[PDB]
Design a protein around this ligand. Structure first.
Ligand SMILES: *[C@@H]1O[C@H](CO)[C@@H](O[C@@H]2O[C@H](CO)[C@@H](O)[C@H](O)[C@H]2NC(C)=O)[C@H](O)[C@H]1NC(C)=O
Lengths: 50, 49
């Protein structure tokens, strides 16, 4: 066995073809951005929510 | 689960992976292949919605 697979059929683990070891792969973080603000007539400051 | 599994479908094309078509086939046919895949995935998303 060389490389694993999840339920959704995407690679998770890989064996190094040079040294006999096992590693697991996860996509680096991602998300959405939301902007919190009062009315424009009140102020111009905002806050960010990742 | 159905929505996530929908990705692997060929949708009439020759493959479901973009990199293989891009690095193995010329851009003129890549246009129609990518069009097919985009149409299929938009249809799936609209159905889910
Ligand atoms: C194949 O990979 C192995 C690693 O598993 C290499 O063996 C290593 O060699 C270095 C020095 O050359 C040692 O410090 C390591 O301890 C060795 N590994 C183990 C697990 O003992 C081997 O050299 C590689 N083969 C080739 C032809 O490069």
């Amino acid at each position: 066995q060389q490389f694993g697979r999840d339920i959704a059929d995407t690679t998770d683990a890989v064996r190094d073809p040079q040294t006999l070891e096992i590693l697991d792969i996860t996509p680096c973080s991602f998300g959405g951005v939301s902007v919190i603000t009062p009315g424009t007539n009140t102020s111009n400051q905002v806050a960010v929510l990742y | 689960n159905t929505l996530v599994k929908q990705l692997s479908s060929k949708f009439g094309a020759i493959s479901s992976v973009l990199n293989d078509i891009f690095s193995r086939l010329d851009p003129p046919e890549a246009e129609v292949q990518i069009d097919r895949l985009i149409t299929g995935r938009l249809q799936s998303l609209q159905t889910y919605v």
